[PDB]
Structure formats: C-alpha cells, structure tokens
Design a protein around this ligand. Sequence first.
Ligand SMILES: Nc1ncnc2c1ncn2[C@@H]1O[C@H](COP(=O)(O)OP(=O)(O)OP(=O)(O)O)[C@@H](O)[C@H]1O
Ligand SMILES: Nc1ncnc2c1ncn2[C@@H]1O[C@H](COP(=O)(O)OP(=O)(O)OP(=O)(O)O)[C@@H](O)[C@H]1O
Ligand SMILES: [Ca+2]
Ligand SMILES: [Zn+2]
Ligand SMILES: [Zn+2]
Lengths: 48, 546, 145
Amino acid sequence: ELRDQQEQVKEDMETKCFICGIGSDYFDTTPHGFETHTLEEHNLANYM
Amino acid sequence: ESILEYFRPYLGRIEIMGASRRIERIYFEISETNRAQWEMPQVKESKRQFIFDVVNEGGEAEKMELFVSFCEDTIFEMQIAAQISEFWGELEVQRVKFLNYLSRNFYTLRFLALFLAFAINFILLFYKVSDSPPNMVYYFLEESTGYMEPALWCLSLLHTLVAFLCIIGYNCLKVPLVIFKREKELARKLEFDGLYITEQPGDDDVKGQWDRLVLNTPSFPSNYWDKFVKRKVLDKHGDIFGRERIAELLGMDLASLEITAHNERKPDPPPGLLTWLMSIDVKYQIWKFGVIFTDNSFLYLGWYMVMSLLGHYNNFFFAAHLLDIAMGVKTLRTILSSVTHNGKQLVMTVGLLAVVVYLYTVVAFNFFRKFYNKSEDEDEPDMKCDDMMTCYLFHMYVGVRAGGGIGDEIEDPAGDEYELYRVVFDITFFFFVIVILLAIIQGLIIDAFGELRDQQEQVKEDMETKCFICGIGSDYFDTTPHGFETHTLEEHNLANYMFFLMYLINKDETEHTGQESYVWKMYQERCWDFFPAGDCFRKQYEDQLS
Amino acid sequence: VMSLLGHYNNFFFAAHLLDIAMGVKTLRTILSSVTHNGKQLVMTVGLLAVVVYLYTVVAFNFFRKFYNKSEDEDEPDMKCDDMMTCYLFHMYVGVRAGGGIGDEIEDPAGDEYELYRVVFDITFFFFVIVILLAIIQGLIIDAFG
Ligand SMILES: Nc1ncnc2c1ncn2[C@@H]1O[C@H](COP(=O)(O)OP(=O)(O)OP(=O)(O)O)[C@@H](O)[C@H]1O
Ligand SMILES: Nc1ncnc2c1ncn2[C@@H]1O[C@H](COP(=O)(O)OP(=O)(O)OP(=O)(O)O)[C@@H](O)[C@H]1O
Ligand SMILES: [Ca+2]
Ligand SMILES: [Zn+2]
Ligand SMILES: [Zn+2]
C-alpha cells in the first residue's frame, strides 16, 4: 500500500495540473498539451 | 458489386488530416505482393512486438514517430525477405544459395538445436560414476542398448554444427535490420539534432563514441536506404559551422560532390574478388562488428556456441542449452524477467536481510553463544558462533532457510538465566527475517511476475478499446453495430498506413496526387501531423451520416 | 464403469465421491482453476524440472559425497551416484522440502567446497522453493480468484 501510494503520487501529478487541477484529458487534445500547460502556462516553480 | 468484391483486398483506404484542417479519406492501391509480404508470420511477429512495446511504454506524441520507424524497419525486413525468397561463379552462387537456406530456415534450425539439446541431455540422464574404469572416479554411460554413446557423440557434433548454422542465419537475417536501425538513427541525429556538429555526445553515450567511427567512412549510409545523408548534413551544417570541417567530419570531398553534382559517367568495378578484399572498408567493418558484438541476441547465440564447444570438453556443458526453452516460450521468459523487474529493490532488500541477520549475529555472538553447539558429540564440539564469520554464515545460511527461525537449529533456552532473552531473540528473528523479509522478497518477485502478465493483458485489452491512430475509444464506435471493427479495419488500419507508405515509395514523384504529395512532403519533413488525432471521418460528418 | 468396477473391488466406489465436486459450484471452480492456466502451469513445471536438472548436473559433477542418506557406515545410500537417481532425489525430496536441498544433504562444514555448497543450497531454496513453487501456487490460486 505504501509503494502503491508512491506510484499514485507520481501518476496523479502527470494526470492533473497541481494548480488548476484540470486533468490531462482536456490538454492532450492539442499535441504535447499537458506538457505545455504544466511547463509554460501553470508551472509550480514559476509561481515561486 | 462484382468489381468491388474483386478489388476489395486491393482497395486500401486511410483517412488523413489534410491541409484543409479536415479528415479526408485517401483511396490507394495495395499491391498483391505487398499484402503477401505483410502476411508472413515474421512480419506479424514484428507488428506484435511493436504494438506491445508502444502500448506498454506509452507516449501519445511519440506514438506516430515510433509507428513510422516501425514501418521503415518492416519495409526493410520484407526487402530482406524478398531477397531471401526461394571456380568463383559457381562458388558464389552456391554460397548465396546456402546462406539463403540458412536465412529461411533460421527458426527451424533453432527448434532443431533445442531438440538436439533435449536429446543430448536425455542421454546424459543415464550417466553414472564408478571407482572402476567403465581415488579415481570414472564417469560413464550405463546403457543396455550400447548405442547411446555413439548417438551422444553424433548428436553433440550435429548440435555444434547447428549452432554454426544458427549464428550464420542470424548474421544473414537479423543483423541487417540492426545495422539498418543504427544507420537510420545516426542519420536522423546528424540531419536534425546535429550532435557531431553542435552537441557533442558525452562519455555516457558509448553508442555515440562508437558511431564516431563511421562518420567519415565512405560506406556510412550503406545499410540505410538514403545515400545522400552526408550531402544533406553538409547543406544544413557547414554553411554556419565550416564546410571544410563538416566535409572532414563526414569523410567526403567537396570536389567529389561537385563532380557528382555535374554530369558524370560511373565506371565499372575491376573484375575479381581479390580487388574486393582490398576494397573492404576496414573502419566501417570494425564499426559493424562492434555494433553486432554487443547486440544481445547475437551475444546469446555466441554464448550458445561457446557452451556447445564446451560440451565437447565435458558433455554436461550441454545442460546450459535447456534454458533455451525459457528464452523461447513467452511467460517463462516473463518468469525470468520478473527476477530483474524489481532488481534494485531486491538487491537492497536482501541487503537489509543481510544487515538485520548481522545484527542478530552480533547479539548472538556477544550473548547466546553456548547455544550453537551443533555437534551431538560430547568430546567434539562444533560451536558455530565462536567466530563472527562462521556465526554470520551459519545465520544467513541455516536460520534464513529455516521456517521457524534460528530457534530450530539452536539449543533450547530452558533452565537458563537468559531464557526470556533467547525467547525474544528467536521470536524476533523468526518474525523479521523469516515471516516478513523473506516474504517481501517473494512479493517483490511474484508481484513483478503478476505485474508483467497484467501489462501484457492490459496491452491486449487497450488495443481493442481505442483506435491506435485516432485514439477514439470503442464507446463512440460501438453505437453502430460492429462499429469499432469497421473503423479499425476499413477506416484506420495500421497496415493500410504501411501500404500507403509503400505506395508513396514505389510511385513516381511525378504521379503522386495532391493528397499523396502532401503526405510525402510531410513524411520527408518528419512532422507526422497527417495522422488523424482526436477525430475521424465519422466525427467530422456525424450530422451528415458519413 | 466405476460402479461396475465397484463389484470387482468395492474400493472403486470411492471414485464416485468426486460427484460432489461436479455438483456444487465453487468446488467445480476449484477443479476448473487447475486447468484455467493449464498451459502456463505445464510449462512452469517444465521450467522447474529444467532448473532442478541443472542443480542435478552441478550436484552430480560436484557435491556428490553429500548425498549419503543412509546413517549406516557399512551401507551407503549415495543418491547422486547416478544421474537418474539424483534427478529423482532432487525433484522428489528437495522440491517438497521447505528449506531446499540443504535440509536433506550433508552439512557443508569443514570442506573446501563450503561456500560453493552454501551458494548452491541458497540458490536452490530461492529459485526452486521460494519462487517457482509459489509461482505454481499463484497460477492456480489466482485462477480460482
Ligand atoms: N502545475 C504543474 N507544475 C509542474 N508540474 C506539473 C504541474 N501539474 C502537473 N505537473 C506534472 O509534474 C511533472 C513534474 O516533472 P518535472 O520533470 O518538471 O519535475 P521532477 O523531475 O518530477 O521534479 P523533482 O526532481 O523535484 O521531483 C510534470 O512533467 C507534469 O507532468
Ligand atoms: N488502427 C487500428 N488498426 C488495427 N487494429 C486496431 C486499430 N485500433 C485498434 N485496433 C485493434 O487491434 C486489433 C488487432 O487484431 P487483428 O486480428 O487485426 O491483428 P492481430 O492478430 O492482433 O495481429 P498480430 O498477429 O500481429 O498480433 C483489432 O481487432 C482492433 O481491436
Ligand atoms: Ca504529376
Ligand atoms: Zn493548470
Ligand atoms: Zn481511428
């Protein structure tokens, strides 16, 4: 269960944006969509 | 209807996302030879693995790039198949016929080698030993028929001969595709990445350090179909980065490329094979030998032959060839992969087991030492915990294997001042070492096996739930009866895309229609946008019922 | 046929007790779970046979004096003097043993092959007992589940 919790943490991050929460399904309509949103649109560091 | 039924297995129709931002259907021609070259078990096996690795590793954006690379590899594979389909002049023609026989019968020779290994080891099951000839021991077969020893010798010789044939067949069959992929990836890196021009590979990229050899060799793009990659790299690198420097890096001459650009007549090679042996490219051949002497399948075959030759020193080295069944069938290979699937975790968990057992050794060395007299003899004691090394070996060997901990093999703690101390010590050893840690190792391998089998089943299930090209799931298609079937067989069929690629390749560039020229230019520029993603003809004209 | 054989010998009657397994649902499911992964089980027990045969070759060429099961000094019962007898001894006794073949072989102490036999017994207990047998258990129990 602990190892499954660790796997889930990594998976959840790649599925939903930490800030807006919107999942990767709305972003992957455009190619490399989630990557664009979670790196240029809403990157955690950028907020820092 | 009759014409449609006759040309149905020749009418391949794929849908492309065109320049009009619309999903448009392209109807091309599938050659009969092209379909026949798609439907042998080897190409099907290639597609099966490709689909497995793509669905397992993932990546929606890289999916089309890997699909196109697979199409190129499989085109070259059926080119190999076409070449291998069905006094020096006689010698070379007989040599190519013999290599052809080996290349077509590679798998049959593999099965024959495994059969010979099984037969040899079945004979070896009759081996016995005796102090007398069939301080000195003699290992001889005990057989009443008297034929199993000549049969053993004959089968050993035949098995090493088949080992020769299998390595030659691999060299003539699977090695060319490996070279083709290596040359292709090096050409793509030079054309697009420009690594040897700008981003020099580091020490970790031993593949790049070895690829540096064929940078200047004239036979650089030999196995790869494109022969002008050097000129392309000069066109997009050297204007900015130094044309003479790039020419030196690629081992080609500016005047030579000028005279090839101008009108020129190609001469004929000198007659004879003694010129050829002097015309072999030493550097390119060394690079090819380096990239096939590290290919894992060829290394397995070389190890197979090394074991076969050692089987002539001692016949029991032929027992190593029984692992070929594990390398052959699928889920036994999965059992072997499950050992290393969590290999890092297993190594450090057995390290934790070693550490905790060492702690039990220190506390059973300082205390609890008189309870390790394994010898029942009173005159001769065999205290296993008088030395730290011997006590640690005793623990890690015997106590771990014991199901009730070290208390099974230590003296009973009764009538002694340390009674509850040893009770707690044995209980904690049986709990942590046996009950917990060993079962964690069991979990780390068995759950790895289950996870690998679940990955295979998930690959098979995912394919039937979403279209590999547009991705749209089966829920949108199953509204119409047999919907997904129709969409993934007549609308977007992986093969149909491969057949379009071949049709573009073998069609003259002056005949390609607007759609075909668009797809061809897209393929040249490596954009992969012509694949429909997230939409299809049905989705575009849902209101128009088409 | 079993009923008629029950008149030759009454103990052929049992054969008719399996009718309860054919009758109730999940006992029939226990019997179906044996063959639900039958191909995998056959080839995994084949792998078990192969690896045990490898342990037999390496305990036949080496580690042969450690198979004297007889406690009598005058009469030895070396189980690994013949390849067939050693393979039978392994697949029969060592697989059933929970601590591998080291339970039923002589202790490797005070011998030049000490760490060799330690590694041999550990790898036998690990691959044959810990892993492969539990994989067979998984292949049937997960089939039931
Ligand atoms: N708002 C967000 N900002 C950053 N990453 C996000 C966000 N939402 C989701 N993610 C996911 O988090 C991933 C973080 O990967 P990245 O390579 O940026 O860091 P990392 O290597 O995981 O960081 P660290 O080394 O600190 O663990 C992204 O690739 C993306 O899938
Ligand atoms: N675009 C697609 N092209 C082909 N198959 C698709 C596609 N999208 C989803 N699929 C699924 O892939 C399945 C492939 O089954 P098919 O019988 O065509 O080949 P196969 O026998 O699995 O091939 P192989 O023998 O190479 O493994 C289809 O039945 C379908 O469910
Ligand atoms: Ca035209
Ligand atoms: Zn966001
Ligand atoms: Zn589709």
